[PDB]
């Protein structure tokens, strides 16, 4: 029901926490290092010219075929 | 150690170059010239 | 038996040393009887040696399997010996042994060998139990660091405190390392390079990812404590307590929660830059090459055929479309050739 | 929604707008209990540390601080307004109201983009910047 | 133990010699970097409100919303019902 | 200077010579740092000799090394401080034992032989 | 010329002698959905084969 | 956001008010850290955390997790039924379902490890003998390890390299991981025999491998796993597949 | 005639690594098989989540297609029986074609007349005589009784077709379809895979 009804018993039980117990309560620190948290940067660096060369090389097929290549070779 | 020796050399070089650049900043030593060579003859002094 | 009954000029440690030399003698007799069992059994089911490398497990398996290989199926006693994966592997292999039966007198001889091997195993258990009981007197610091069963086992496998003292830490870490054949898995068996030290409760009471880092430290400190004890110094146990305190402090340091780390704000959405050999090279790498310049273009009104099914709209420009380019084919720039990093290269070199 | 600083009267709002000469003052007019305001405030809270070099975020309750309701037409549940050097920075979000963000933003990155665009455009003395994304639709499909 | 320093040459003994080798080779730029970090990381205004305002804001949120709190199920954003 | 169980304790001049030779062996990649590496070189007989510092707080952690040198016929002494041995070994951390090892056709032959002859003459 | 289900013009392809060693290419084209984070409309075929 | 506000208000009301007021934000830090630990299927335990605060945070995490799972499934059902929905909602739901699936998969792997193989060797023996009899009936000669002077070893290597390469063919903008993968492919193509030696060494000796990455492609009806393998192991695996 | 169209429920996930290693050693050198099965047992990661794929298979591996096809060949053997598998494939000297048989008599020697397996989807075409169908239905019903004629409630037919174009669920070919599915599902151990 009222969100603040499921936590009523725990809220009541919180009263037994001593004031010194309210002061240990460690600060939360991340566990991931300098590379995970703030990575330096990712450059783009376009594709090599060999990709275009091979794409245009795919083609200019042939003028003749060895009479040995069958329906599947 | 090797690391300590390299660190000492690096600190000495950095101190020397920093003092040299402060001297250049204060006119005591005229600003350095570009290190022109035969291969550098046309990148530094092309129009000349 | 006299020592245990009287456990309420002929000292105790002479008995201890004689017993510990008897342990290695027993181990040698155990390995020769294992040799005999393996040699005389590998004509019925010869593949088992390649499936169960442990000597005692092999002996128990040949005592249990015997000449009847129907006892690999619907047999609970194997589950007391082997892992389920290796049990199913040996069942699979025993389905296709290609090995003839054993003669009856051969079975009698092999059963006698198995029984004598088990007798020697029981004797080894009893003598190691006595050594473990006498730990506190015979090696106070080494027992302080790692229990009593672990210290007893490591010096029993090493051959006494004197033999263990002349051993480096990188080998004490490996006291009890079993072959541990991998059956399909990926050397995820926790025993590729682990021994009695790694399976000691002090190392096992850590997260599974710090356990090898803990085992190395424990082995080093155990080497130190064994060297301390080999001359019977620090009888009361100060050195062992200091080493254990150091080990526990280094273990707490590893599990100490990570420090509070600040969030880096975005710098600013907004100066002169140099130029030289590095700038020229980086500009040439990122420069728009003639082949890449020519793929940028596209003829007007000259409709190209849609090559490369997998992605329509992918089109070369004036590369080969017989449009307005040049007569000869364009050449690949060497500066655009893909290369690997410096760290990646050094890892590719350490791999060799 | 409660971690961000709150402005408790119109004078504090005016001083917060005036106190910044190098960061975009981002002010959320609305009620902390409103669902739309809480949705917007989660996003503003998640980016408040990331943009502290060029933006500051304040919250304002439009009942406890009612002076700007008629002035700024603060008659929507949530409203996000950008000021740069005592000047309201209009933004052409494509929603027909170039004066405010009167809805809840679902993305952490889109508000960072909007704040950075406002900052970069307003440094050049522009009263109206153009949002990098058109919000005339929701691209649901 | 009167030793010799490969940096200065003074007679530093056995134990404090090691620390000498950590201090005599300490980079002077480290001092400038640490002072720069102190000057840059301590002149920053707090992004979030202090604890006072967090407690107050949560209190007013509880007061202005009984859909999440209270025992009487009142309206969405009205006063105390 | 304090512990008498470190019996072959060298003098100052021999300490200088020995640390210098250890530095040269580290330069020639003939040095093995640490007690565990000294033990591993003992078991293979690939060691000319062994130097060990007499200042390990537990000293008996390096007295197995003399007993193994006796079994393998390897010269051994004690030096006065661990930090000097560590620095002589190219390691900022305190090294308590190092092993100068054999290498066929090396240029450090004569110095090693002389330091050995000096070493196996002070052992009493 | 462009007829036949293996496309008789594929006999003339430049790579015709280094494709004879590519076996099981349909299965790996189908399984490519588990390696690249994109849906391939021509998962069933291969233009060079 | 209502649950977090309620839990924070409840924990901060029991705060000793006048004696301490700077630790309001660390409570939120703990409340978010516990939720992140739940989302990562990582156990959450703070040493210095008092037991009542621990229990309140655990209750918050359980309530938020129940709502999170229910919202994930409801939204997935909405996406599947062709309902009109934003792109960002689909991406957030995909990220949510990835974590739910991987929690259910860690549980499945743990169950397999605890309960061992489910294949009860008798029927495993049946399957194996069936396969053995089939292969003997076909007179199938087992595939050998690739010989040193394997004639068309380089042809298979080139096929594997081109198969790996034909994923960046249209990706006009590269990436550091993609740049490294392309560099490895080019280095193996320019220097084929050393690459083949490395592949043979990996096949003979390598049994432990670096972790792979898992992503989910959303087909709006089911999630398709996509696995990112290390570029150095991909070359060996591609060659092995071709061979 | 009866067409069963199905797929092994979760083939990829329920592949034992140890059994896969032992099955692969029948085909390839043990080094290669050990390499592949070890490569399947790696750590799987998603942004903070890390587990170890100790049970299932990894589809993203390059050779995962080969492993899946071979493992599905094993299931094809389990379904067809060695005799029918050897008759469909024919003698190794002259292997059969796509769906051809050496002789007409060999084709009609078994209920299962056509069989195909896409990566994990099986299609089996049976042709039953008037007596074999009733014997199989009788065995299925003696195994699973159905006095209320409840077998039509769960039956699936393609709703894309009109009412008279799809399958008619009379009484006999519903029990026959259930019997065929039951008989095909029994020869697959549920531990390995299930339908």
**Quaternary structure state of the chains depicted:** part of a larger assembly
Q: Quick one: how many beta strands of chain E?
A: 0
The backbone outline of chain A, from C-alpha atoms, is elongated
Distance between the termini of chain A: 73 Å
The number of distinct helices of chain A, counting runs of at least 4 residues, comes to 5
How much helicity do the residues of chain A have? 25-40%
Strand tally of chain A is 0
The gross shape of chain E turns out to be rod-shaped
Helix/strand class of chain A = mainly alpha
What proportion strand of chain E?
under 5%
Which range best describes the helical content of chain E: under 10%, 10-25%, 25-40%, 40-55%, 55-70% or over 70%? 40-55%
- Helix/strand-derived category of chain E reads mainly alpha
User: Alpha-carbon distance between the termini of chain E?
Assistant: 83 Å
**Roughly how many Å is the radius of gyration of chain E?**
30 Å
PDB class: splicing
Keywords: spliceosome, spliceosomal B complex, splicing
Entry title: cryo-EM structure of the human spliceosomal B complex protomer (tri-snRNP core region)
Chain A: Pre-mRNA-processing factor 6
Q: What does this protein look like?
A:
This is part of a larger assembly, with nine protein chains of seven kinds. Chain C has helices at residues 2-5, 12-41, 48-51, 55-65, 84-94, 104-133, 135-138, 140-145, 149-158, 161-165, 169-172, 201-204, 211-229, 238-255, 277-286, 290-296, 342-350. By secondary structure, chain C is mostly helical. The radius of gyration of chain C is 34 Å and the shape is flat. Chain D has 141 residues and is of the alpha/beta class. Chain D is built from four helices and six strands; from the N terminus they run βαβαβαββαβ. The longest helix of chain D has 16 residues, at 108-123. Helix content of chain E is 46%, strand content 0%. The longest helix of chain E has 14 residues, at 28-41. Chain G is mostly loops. Helix content of chain G is 14%, strand content 0%. The two termini of chain G are 15 Å apart. Chain C: Residues 138-256 form the Nop domain.
